[PDB]
């Protein structure tokens, strides 16, 4: 009966040592995940504020803007639309303004 008890104790010790190894691997994986997960948080926190600042500045600057018309928008848009489908340039003669 002694041999059976010795074998059972050895098997239990081996299984619990494997449990130690599994626990150590889990500890290492959790530590690595914690260390590497939250590295760029400071950089993103700094970047978001600057992006918001520049975006607000430009959306405020957009109000103070004056646009002057020109004699080429209609012809350019017509050329673009004629090129979009059946992509051949519009037939002759030439349109109002070509550039």
């Amino acid at each position: 009966h002694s041999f059976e008890e010795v074998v059972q104790t050895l098997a239990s010790l081996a299984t619990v040592v494997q449990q130690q190894t599994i626990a150590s691997e889990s500890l290492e994986q959790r530590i690595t995940s914690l260390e590497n997960g939250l590295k760029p948080v400071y950089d993103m926190a700094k970047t978001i504020s600057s992006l918001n600042r520049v975006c607000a500045e430009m959306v405020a600057k957009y109000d103070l803007l004056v646009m002057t018309t020109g004699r080429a928008t209609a012809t350019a848009a017509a050329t673009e639309a004629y090129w979009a489908e059946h992509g051949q340039p519009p037939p002759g003669p030439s349109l109002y303004e070509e550039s």
């Binding site: 646009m67 018309t69 004699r71 012809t75 639309a81 519009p90 037939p91 002759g92």
Partner: protein
């Protein structure tokens, strides 16, 4: 078939040819090509004509413009001379007068029978009407002008034989009509003199020294015009006679106060306008144009006076003074003339009349004629403000586009359930997702910060290219443009100098396919010709004609945009003010850089791609010109025909829009701008549009207990600030609103055809009552057509105002006179034919013409003027009303035993195909019209037999009460009962309407 009414713009460019054939000099046209062009085959035999040669044997080679002479002829022509027409229009005058008293008959009898009549009855009424009609200033001149119109219509009808020449010698004036052209020989002494010693008319074409050796020993001068100025002058004389007669008649009923200005103020206004026109030529219409704004300003001042109520009158007065001093400094007026010419607006300003009288005076505006339209000036007017640069604010465009999308979304939310399942990313709208998830729509108060999110909303094609069930829009026998390969074929091929090498001769899904494929950019589909507008007082206005497929695209876009869109922008203590803005000036102020987002959104709202931006793609590529027969674009030759040069009446880069085309989109954009102003400035705005005028009302809302003096001032101030904000927004959008043209009023609202003063209707009848003429466009001069036109004019005249007898007397005068004209002088029939002899075989006396003119048309007769219509315009059953009117008329006269053998008649030989077409009517040929082998003989035969039908007699022989009409009848009867009596003079408290158990 020449027409008897003014329906075309007055262009005298071809007269340069006529005066060239007669060996005269006339610089009517601005095109030098006509100075040395080859004359046509016609209007060149004038060298071989003997009557014309004899006519021009005592006049100088230099002629005179007709612009300065029309006012002279309007006063120097009266009927005393000899005319080739055998039955003079003045010979059958008394009969007409008699017929007029026959409506001082029965109409009075009809009102007496109904029960209205009048409490105050005066015996001296018939001779008052007789003296008023007889003592009319424009009576004999009217008959002479109608003689001239008949003669010139007969002369123009032939135009190609020896019968096309006619001569009239009216005392001190000579007239020679040859084939659509008229020569006036007038004395020199009648023309007003320039300070240099020449007439004011001759200083525009000749130097002072040149127009002194041309005349020397000559006492008469010749002016050449088209046979169109005769029609205009006849129309002016008829209108003046009508308004003077109406004014004179209206004062006999209630001498204390009438609704018409006077018969003497209008006379001096006419004289002042005629003198101004004679002095200033066609340029003098700039001052006649001010009759209506001055009248509006005077009406505005007929209420409580506020510091800004009188701003409009001051602005109009300043504009009048500046215009008068601007078109006069170059002209060398005499010191006496400079004072006499300042009488039109001087009298207009100093008027002291009630608002109703001013509103009636508003209608007499085209009574002085219309200017001669030159294609060059008309082209330059749109070129000056249709090819210029604009400054735009992208922020205002963004706000307007966001408001456009928001209005579309709100319209789709209010109907058709709620929201439209936005197929866009939800992160781009942080603040609209809350309302979409809860299926709620954001109200006005807090939509100022989430407006930009409306840019990011995407949706399926809300509407579809469907529900089009009217082909009448696709064809209406209107005018379009020719193809590009043959575009100069419109002009006369003798002025051109070359023979044009090229000469001119479905399904909705196909229209969509044509528009989508960008096939309106093909080289043969780009003309957009201009055509001058009809009678107007402007320096000149034009509308566009397009090639047929592009016209179909335009109509399709109009229908789709009026069906799907344009419904999100409807035409709709608390004190509300209002102001009126002009919408036509917007048409030329639209640029692609501003309308591109709206057009793209409209395209995306459908499944279509490039249909809504046809105009902006095709208009700038077109060659802009006016399609007038006798003046082509300058320097037009055979070599440079495919690429015509840019002259004074032509241009290429039409960057802006065009009036009328794509009107719904521009109206929607204007409504979006108004909504943006309402969002930015927190006031309740109600906007409506009617044609060319948009009325915006601002509601103030007050906390009560603020009296009523400061309340109106605060409302006016709020309206002023709203108008200022709207002007800012519109100017930032590229369209400039003139600050010194806006009313900014409180009670007086002017909109379309309705002018209200403190909720009280302002009468207007002279718009329609003065248009009654014995001659009209009624296809081959149908008597029934003219009678029906007069009846419709009487309908519209009685619709407004409160006087019955003026319009009734005018229509009675005109009906008999028209019947006599048709009986004696018919253009279709040969000269000298009497329609009273070819049908009856015996003279057509007064009895038969008076009897046949009172039987109603619905009964197959000829009468269109029944008194029951004076109570209400909508008639439930015309047949029963006609029977009652005929019965009462025949009961007034001791001729009762004629009613039965007058209504039965003989039903026409027609199947049951017209009974469906006419729900309430009779199957008699007499009541029908031309709605139902050379065509001339057939038309003559139908005319003869139709004349035989009339004037003949004894030869072709729950409940039943509409509660909607009872109230109208009661209120109409009460109004007719008390119209000339004082409110405190009413001795009747209540009236009982007891019906008889017989019908």
């Amino acid at each position: 078939y020449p027409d008897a009414r003014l329906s075309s713009p007055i262009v005298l460019d071809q007269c340069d040819l006529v005066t060239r054939a007669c060996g005269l000099y006339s610089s009517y046209s601005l095109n030098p090509q006509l100075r040395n062009c080859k004359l046509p085959k016609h209007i060149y035999r004038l060298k071989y004509d003997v009557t014309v040669t004899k006519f021009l044997s005592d006049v100088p080679v230099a002629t005179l413009p007709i612009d300065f002479i029309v006012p002279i002829l309007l006063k120097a022509l009266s009927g005393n001379g000899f005319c080739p027409v055998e039955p003079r229009c003045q010979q059958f005058l008394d009969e007409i007068i008699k017929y007029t008293m026959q409506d001082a008959l029965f109409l009075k009898y009809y009102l007496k029978n109904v029960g209205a009549q009048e409490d105050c009855v005066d015996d001296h009424f018939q001779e008052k009407i007789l003296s008023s009609i007889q003592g009319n200033e424009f009576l004999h001149q009217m008959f002479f002008w109608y003689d001239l119109a008949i003669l010139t219509r007969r002369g123009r009808l032939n135009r190609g034989n020896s019968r096309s020449t006619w001569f009239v010698h009216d005392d001190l004036i000579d007239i020679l009509g040859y084939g659509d052209y008229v020569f006036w020989k007038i004395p020199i002494s009648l023309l007003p003199l320039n300070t240099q010693g020449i007439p004011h008319a001759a200083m525009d074409w000749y130097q002072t020294s040149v127009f002194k050796e041309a005349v020397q020993g000559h006492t008469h001068i010749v002016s050449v015009s088209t046979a169109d100025v005769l029609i205009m002058c006849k129309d002016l004389i008829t209108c003046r006679f009508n308004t003077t007669l109406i004014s004179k008649i209206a004062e006999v009923e209630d001498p204390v106060c009438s609704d018409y200005p006077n018969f003497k103020i209008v006379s001096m206004l006419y004289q002042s306008g005629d003198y101004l026109l004679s002095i200033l030529g066609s340029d003098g219409y700039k001052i006649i144009k001010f009759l209506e704004p001055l009248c509006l300003a005077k009406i505005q001042l007929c209420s409580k006076y506020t510091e800004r109520k009188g701003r409009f009158l001051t602005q109009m007065h300043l504009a009048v003074n500046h215009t008068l001093e601007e078109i006069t400094e170059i002209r060398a007026l005499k010191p006496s003339q400079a004072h006499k010419i300042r009488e039109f607006h001087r009298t207009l300003i100093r008027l002291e009349m009630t608002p109703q009288q001013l509103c009636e005076l508003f209608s007499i505006q085209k009574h002085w004629g219309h200017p001669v339209l030159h294609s060059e000036t008309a082209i330059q007017k749109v070129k000056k403000h249709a090819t210029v640069l604009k400054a735009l604010r992208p922020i205002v465009i963004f706000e307007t586009y966001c408001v456009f999308k928001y209005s579309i979304a709100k319209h789709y939310f209010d109907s058709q359930g709620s929201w439209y399942s936005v197929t866009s990313d939800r992160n781009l709208t942080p603040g609209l997702n809350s309302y979409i998830k809860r299926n709620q729509f954001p109200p006005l108060p807090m939509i100022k910060e989430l407006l930009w999110e409306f840019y990011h909303l995407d949706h399926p094609p809300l509407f579809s290219t469907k529900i089009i069930s009217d082909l009448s829009i696709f064809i209406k026998d209107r005018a379009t443009a020719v193809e590009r390969t043959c575009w100069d074929a419109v002009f006369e091929p003798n002025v051109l100098g070359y023979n044009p090498p090229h000469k001119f001769s479905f399904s909705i899904e196909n229209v969509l396919s044509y528009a989508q494929k960008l096939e309106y950019l093909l080289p043969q589909y780009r003309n957009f010709s201009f055509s001058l507008k009809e009678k107007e007082l402007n320096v000149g206005r034009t509308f566009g004609k397009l090639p047929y497929p592009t016209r179909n695209v335009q109509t399709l876009c109009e229908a789709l945009l009026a069906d799907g869109l344009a419904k999100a922008f409807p035409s709709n203590t608390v004190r509300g003010s209002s102001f009126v803005t002009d919408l036509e000036k917007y048409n030329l102020a639209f640029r692609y850089e501003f309308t591109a987002p709206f057009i793209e959104y409209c395209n995306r709202c459908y499944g279509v791609k490039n249909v809504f931006n046809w105009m902006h793609y095709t208009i700038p590529q077109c060659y802009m010109h006016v399609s007038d027969y006798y003046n082509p674009p300058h320097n037009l030759t055979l070599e440079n025909r495919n690429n015509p040069p840019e002259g004074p009446s032509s241009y290429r880069g039409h960057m802006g829009g065009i009036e009328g085309l794509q009107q719904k989109l521009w109206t929607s954009i204007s409504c979006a701008q108004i909504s943006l102003v309402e969002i930015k400035t927190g006031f309740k705005l109600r906007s409506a549009v009617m044609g060319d005028n948009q009325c915006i009302t601002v509601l103030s809302v007050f906390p009560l207990e603020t009296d009523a003096d400061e309340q109106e001032q605060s409302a006016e101030d709020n309206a002023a600030r709203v108008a200022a904000s709207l002007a800012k927004v519109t100017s930032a959008c590229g369209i400039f609103l003139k600050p010194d043209e806006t009313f900014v009023h409180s009670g007086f609202i002017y909109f379309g055809k309705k002018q209200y003063l403190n909720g009280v209707q302002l009468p207007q009848s002279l718009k329609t009552a003065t248009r009654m003429a014995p001659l009209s466009d009624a296809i081959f001069d149908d008597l029934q057509g003219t009678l029906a036109s007069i009846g419709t004019a009487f309908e519209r005249s009685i619709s407004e105002t409160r006087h019955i007898f003026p319009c009734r007397i005018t229509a009675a005068f005109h009906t008999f006179f028209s019947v006599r004209i048709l009986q004696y002088h018919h253009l279709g029939f040969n000269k000298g034919f009497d329609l009273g002899q070819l049908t009856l075989g015996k003279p057509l006396d007064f009895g038969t013409i008076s009897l046949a003119l009172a039987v109603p048309q619905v009964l197959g007769g000829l009468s269109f003027l029944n008194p029951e219509k004076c109570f209400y315009r909508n008639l439930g059953d015309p047949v029963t009303s006609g029977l009652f009117q005929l019965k009462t008329y025949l009961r007034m006269i001791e001729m009762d035993d004629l009613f039965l053998p007058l209504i039965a008649k003989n039903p026409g030989n027609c199947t049951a195909i017209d009974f469906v077409l006419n729900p309430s009517g009779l199957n008699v040929p007499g009541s029908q019209d031309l709605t139902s082998t050379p065509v001339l003989d057939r038309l003559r035969k139908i005319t003869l037999q139709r004349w035989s039908l009339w004037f003949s007699y004894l030869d072709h022989c729950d409940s039943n009460i509409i509660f909607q009409n009872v109230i109208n009848y009661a209120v109409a009867l009460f109004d007719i009962k008390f119209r000339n009596t004082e409110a405190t003079d009413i001795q009747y408290n209540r009236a009982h309407l007891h019906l008889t158990k017989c019908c």
